[PDB]
Write a protein that binds this ligand. Sequence first.
Ligand SMILES: CN[C@@H]1[C@@H](O)[C@@H](O[C@@H]2[C@@H](O)[C@H](O[C@H]3O[C@H]([C@@H](C)O)[C@@H](O)[C@H](O)[C@H]3N)[C@@H](N)C[C@H]2N)OC[C@]1(C)O
Ligand SMILES: CN[C@@H]1[C@@H](O)[C@@H](O[C@@H]2[C@@H](O)[C@H](O[C@H]3O[C@H]([C@@H](C)O)[C@@H](O)[C@H](O)[C@H]3N)[C@@H](N)C[C@H]2N)OC[C@]1(C)O
Ligand SMILES: [Zn+2]
Lengths: 50, 71, 119, 86
Amino acid sequence: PSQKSFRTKQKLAKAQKQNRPLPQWIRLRTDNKIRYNAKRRHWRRTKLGI
Amino acid sequence: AMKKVEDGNTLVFQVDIKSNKHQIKSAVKELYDVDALYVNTLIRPNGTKKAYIRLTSDYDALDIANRIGYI
Amino acid sequence: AGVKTFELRTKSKEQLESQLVELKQELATLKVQKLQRPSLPRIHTVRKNIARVLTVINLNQRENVRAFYAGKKYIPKDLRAKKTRALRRKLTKFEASQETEKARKQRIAFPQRKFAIKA
Amino acid sequence: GKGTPSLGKRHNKSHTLCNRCGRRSFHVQKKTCSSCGYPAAKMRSHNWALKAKRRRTTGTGRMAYLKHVTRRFKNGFQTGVAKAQT
RNA sequence: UUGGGCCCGGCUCUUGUCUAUGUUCCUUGGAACAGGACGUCACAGAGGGUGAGAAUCCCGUGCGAUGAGAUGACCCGGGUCU
RNA sequence: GCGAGAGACCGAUAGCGAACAAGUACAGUGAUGGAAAGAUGAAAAGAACUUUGAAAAGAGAGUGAAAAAGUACGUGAAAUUG
RNA sequence: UGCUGUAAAGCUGGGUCGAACGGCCUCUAGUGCAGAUCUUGGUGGUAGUAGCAAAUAUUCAAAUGAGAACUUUGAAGACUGAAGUGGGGAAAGGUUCCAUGUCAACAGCAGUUGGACAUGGGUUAGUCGAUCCUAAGAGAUGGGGAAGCUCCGUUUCAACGUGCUUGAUUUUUCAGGCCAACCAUCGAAAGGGAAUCCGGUUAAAAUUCCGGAACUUGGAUAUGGAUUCUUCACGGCAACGUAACU
RNA sequence: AGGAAUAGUUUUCAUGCCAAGUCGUACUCAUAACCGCAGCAGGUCUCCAAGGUUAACAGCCUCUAGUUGAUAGAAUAAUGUA
RNA sequence: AAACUUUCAACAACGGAUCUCUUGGUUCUCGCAUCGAUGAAGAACGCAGCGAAAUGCGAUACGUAAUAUGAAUUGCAGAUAUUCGUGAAUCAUCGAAUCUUUGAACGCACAUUGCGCCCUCUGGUAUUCCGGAGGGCAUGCCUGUUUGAGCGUCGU
Ligand SMILES: CN[C@@H]1[C@@H](O)[C@@H](O[C@@H]2[C@@H](O)[C@H](O[C@H]3O[C@H]([C@@H](C)O)[C@@H](O)[C@H](O)[C@H]3N)[C@@H](N)C[C@H]2N)OC[C@]1(C)O
Ligand SMILES: CN[C@@H]1[C@@H](O)[C@@H](O[C@@H]2[C@@H](O)[C@H](O[C@H]3O[C@H]([C@@H](C)O)[C@@H](O)[C@H](O)[C@H]3N)[C@@H](N)C[C@H]2N)OC[C@]1(C)O
Ligand SMILES: [Zn+2]
């Protein structure tokens, strides 16, 4: 809701930060295994459970 | 932000999340030798704090922004 | 590379504090230039210079207090030896070596002898 | 009406976030965490739940202090500083 | 029959430095670490690496040598003054 | 728990649940529940350039020992299909 | 491609392939599958089949584009019909908001469109809330149980003030005096509660920004006024009035 | 308790001076932003409320505002559903 | 006779069996004794020139000092970075520090980034009002200090 606690909003800020695709320069590093960010989240599919 | 600089004599800064309006006013005074008419604060959706600082009529925000170096 | 620690320890507390002010001003200047270049590897150097000056100030003042409490019965807890909680509760060498006079007399009277067999 | 219609009336949280363990197991009305037992002094654990012990135990976190005890013991819990060589 | 205060060693622990002998010729192969020939070292032919099964290319392995530090009423071997 | 050495043990549906960003992803109000998933090549040399196509792609070409190795990548069975 | 064995099986030709493997004498076992509504994974027939039919309804032209029943603009025909298909909120979600790009997957047709994908931008308060109060209730504390985790008690069998006021004194010490029945704390974004309005402004914020005009609380403190020689004001029969008026 | 004679008030009269911290604030609130595994005909608290007809905030038509969404095309047997 | 269906063969699919391996597991043995109010284990949130994880770390934030060592790091970029040297890189070593918000978790409270009080310094004309910096205020119990209470009680 619009009315929200500081603790909740801080959790929501971190959730936005982790919802980004891989930086593509990572894939160029010597013996890199990560091809994509496997920990993405969409707001309508999987809920944050706060 | 720079539109607010050009019009409302307001400087826009990112500030430490723990600071209050009194500390921000004192800090801009000590760093830039300006006087704030007020400080309006805001915690952004990414978790950092933004301060809207309007300078008194004795100061020109555009000149201070040129001197600080980001315009 | 940045400021050199062996050079910092020669300085006084006044010269260190004025250098810290100028490094902070320089880091602020680089963050402004960070808005429009926007890649500044120089920032890493100045950040670590601030860490070194802050370190040298702290270790200077920490040695003043160690000299201030040297030989005192009670000294601040962060200057006391920190081994482990259990080791600090253990009896000191003096306390562990305490002997009753009854036990001391018997130890002197009957020490372990030195001996061999076949002669 | 006990299925899909009743499932529409779920908008009051029974649990919120626990300060001690952070799980969303802090029961709002009982003011007790169902996971770690906060605010009791002891952490909640049971021998009938060994897998719960695995999830939250020594070594699942950072061990910011115990990490270095075995190296400090190995040197006899030294005091002082290292000496430059001749 | 005899107490005690200390110095140096030993032992104990931790730790630095150092080490034998083919990358010779021919064939296959992208690559020789394969096969053949001729050898070498070996108190070392454990193991790993290196473009395929490598004692001999590299790290090690085996054998020793030589230094620095720490700790010990509650370990002992000599010396020093009460 | 910390440090080591091993085995007539298992070899990716096995062996710990986990050989991998595994107590992860995900589920549940909660206590709890809890996966799947290893291998191009010696080396990216990861296909410049031309051409058809809106493009994805195709066809030539090119690299490589091999493309009957093309990041849908070792080998590549059966069911099933052209 | 054949050969051997009654058989379990063994050997061989051709193709594919790329790093280890076999015969014999013995040892040993987590040692042989067609079934267990077996387990995990994979794949069929069914089958281009059932079906994609509630909520009145769409049409012409242009623009864009490789591509338009489905996008945008214009024209029109309709509907919700203020107990709305309008305009806002609480709970819940958490960036879905906005602009720009953008179509592999998703939107059970399509897609140039999108709550999708990518990159950025965006949430401004003394006056709106929270914050504070107590409600049902929850719950520390001297304590009394319980082997104990803990249970019970809260007007709680208790020596329970982190008290307050002045006269000031600086000496940061005093001198008194007044009381201590009650009061840990938590418990409402709908109860109680200090105080803000209008106009304008953005791609996206506004009772928060800009312009103008106010208000409340806490503090300091100067002028003006009022009061006092009848010391702590006058007037009105009265109800009561007043700029003040220990 | 303290207060007038050429002196203290009193900021419950007027005017003037200073300051007001922290967290929330975008957007949805539903036949697609919540819960029902989903963009599900279900479920989910509340405020504002125009003209005509009428007893009426019912039904029916309309203004402001908002939508024109729900795969589509061609035909119109049987048997269905309404 | 085609189509269609069925059987086989070749090639191509679908799928991931087989074979080969293995910084993992599993069991056995040998050795050692070291968590925490000097704030642990655990939690949250942050930190990089370009990072979402994992790994590391704490506003000194993929780290500061020190000791050792001796030329890198590397995906790209880049020193006001370096090479016969107080010198690149290094969780090599590690004895000095830093160590947000918490947590037994300690001023009170905590579904709040809510609310006090004490001391020193400091800003606004200020012992009181408003602001900033630093340092403090939990409970049970022990020893001691000091200040006290009770006709419990001695003496004068
Ligand atoms: C890019 N897709 C990834 C892909 O990396 C995949 O890997 C498999 C890989 O595991 C297989 O490789 C396999 O090789 C052997 C053998 C069966 O081949 C297996 O035993 C082994 O598990 C596995 N490494 C490889 N043959 C095909 C890839 N798509 O792993 C999962 C995935 C998401 O599909
Ligand atoms: C013989 N011993 C008794 C001892 O039992 C005790 O007596 C209590 C007494 O204090 C209580 O009474 C007390 O406590 C209650 C409280 C419990 O509500 C209070 O209401 C009451 O005012 C108070 N006097 C009484 N209700 C019970 C007696 N056994 O205390 C008094 C005593 C003489 O020592
Ligand atoms: Zn918890």
